[PDB]
Homo-oligomer: A and B are copies of this chain.
């Protein structure tokens, strides 16, 4: 449902592009989007 610009640059758009690239779009999922993001950035910076 959401829509996004081309040149993803902001957490703000990213939080939506994720919801997009995955079909399912629901509050059981979005509201924890950010948690997932936290997990990922942490997993990265942990050793990058």
Residues of A at under 8 Å CB distance from B?
3-4, 6-8, 17, 20, 31-32, 34-35, 38
Residues of chain B with a CB closer than 8 A to A32's CB:
4, 6, 20
Which 4 pairs between the two chains have the least Cβ-Cβ distance? Answer: A6-B34, A6-B35, A7-B38, A8-B35
Question: Hey, which chain B residues are within 8 Å of A4, CB to CB?
Answer: 31-32, 35
Query: Inside 8 A of A6's CB, which chain B residues have their CB?
Result: 31-32, 34-35, 38
- Could you write out 16 A-B pairs with CB less than 8 Å apart? A3-B31, A4-B31, A4-B32, A4-B35, A6-B31, A6-B32, A6-B34, A6-B35, A6-B38, A7-B34, A7-B35, A7-B38, A8-B35, A8-B38, A17-B35, A20-B32
